[PDB]
């Protein structure tokens, strides 16, 4: 009777994968989005006597960390990072986080925020001279020019905190901001040091890395798997219906 | 879970949402209209 559950599980987890895939495709135009990878893992039931039942469960082993195609928008605050680089922004709960969205905005009082998260430099959050033509160099040096004054000024202000961390060492949080894993936190400390070897380009915005070929193949496979599990469920139900007459003496 | 093997878990997303639509305040080109009442701003400023 329980073979109608095994297949059911697969069907249910199929829907889960579909959700993940949709969550990727809804973010096809999101800047600095890292598509979540999905993977079914098989769990066997341990016990007597004949191990025949093996269920599935979906999981998301992190994200896909191949940098996307760059968007050339003529805005000096827009930045694109070298492969395996992260900007450090203060998250909601007063803690550090890593993001790839390089669309930096200037607040009314001069605070640099990405998506409302105040960016953190070498000395903490950055305070920009209210109203200034910000120019970011190739390594994160910020130069501010005040309107009206001469151009022999372009005095530097600070430097962004760019972090090197591969995709294996980082896990996503529920707010969409990436953080270090527990093992990586133990092995590389809590707060990562800024790597001066990371190159940052100003005037370009990085898009998402949602591959449409993979999404289409995943949808086709999910649909076929769902139909197979529904057929198995129907077969099991019909068999039990036929079998439940024996009890008639 | 507790860790050669892939990480377990399942963090489903929720979808997309537009947060803010921005206008690029870069100075545009100048078009010549001989009438004496049109003027063009050379830089960062607005008429009140």
């Amino acid at each position: 009777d329980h073979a109608i559950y095994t297949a059911m599980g697969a069907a249910s987890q199929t829907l889960n994968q579909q959700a993940v895939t949709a969550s990727n495709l809804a973010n096809a135009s999101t800047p600095g989005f890292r598509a979540q990878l999905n993977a079914l893992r098989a769990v066997p039931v341990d016990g007597l006597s004949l191990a025949t039942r093996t269920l599935v469960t979906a999981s998301t082993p992190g994200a896909d960390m191949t940098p996307g195609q760059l968007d050339y928008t003529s805005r000096p605050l827009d930045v694109a990072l070298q492969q395996d680089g992260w900007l450090v922004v203060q998250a909601a709960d007063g803690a550090e986080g890593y993001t790839r969205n390089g669309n930096i905005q200037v607040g009314p009082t001069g605070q640099l925020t990405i998506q409302g998260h105040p960016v953190i430099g070498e000395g903490g959050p950055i305070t920009v001279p209210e109203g200034s033509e910000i120019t970011i160099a190739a390594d994160g040096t910020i130069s501010a020019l005040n309107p009206g004054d001469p151009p022999n000024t372009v005095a530097p202000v600070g430097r962004l905190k760019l972090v090197k961390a591969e995709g294996n060492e980082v896990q996503r949080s529920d707010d969409g901001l990436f953080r270090l894993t527990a093992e990586a936190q133990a092995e590389r400390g809590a707060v990562l040091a800024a790597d001066p070897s990371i190159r940052i380009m100003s005037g370009v915005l990085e898009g998402s890395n949602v591959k449409p070929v993979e999404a289409m193949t995943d949808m086709i496979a999910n649909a076929r798997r769902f139909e197979m599990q529904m057929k198995v469920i129907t077969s099991v139900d019909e068999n039990e219906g036929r079998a439940n007459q024996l009890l008639s003496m | 879970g507790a860790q050669t093997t892939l990480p377990s878990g399942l963090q489903i997303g929720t979808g997309v949402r537009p947060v803010a639509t921005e206008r690029l305040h870069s100075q545009g080109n100048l078009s010549q209209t001989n009438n004496s009442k049109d003027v063009a701003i050379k830089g960062q400023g607005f008429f009140q």
Partner: peptide, 21 residues
């Protein structure tokens, strides 16, 4: 021994972990 026999001992609990402990 054979599936469907009679024994004086309850079967062990049927645990199926998702990850190796």
């Amino acid at each position: 021994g054979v599936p469907g026999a009679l024994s004086n001992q309850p079967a062990p609990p049927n645990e199926a972990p998702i990850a190796t402990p």
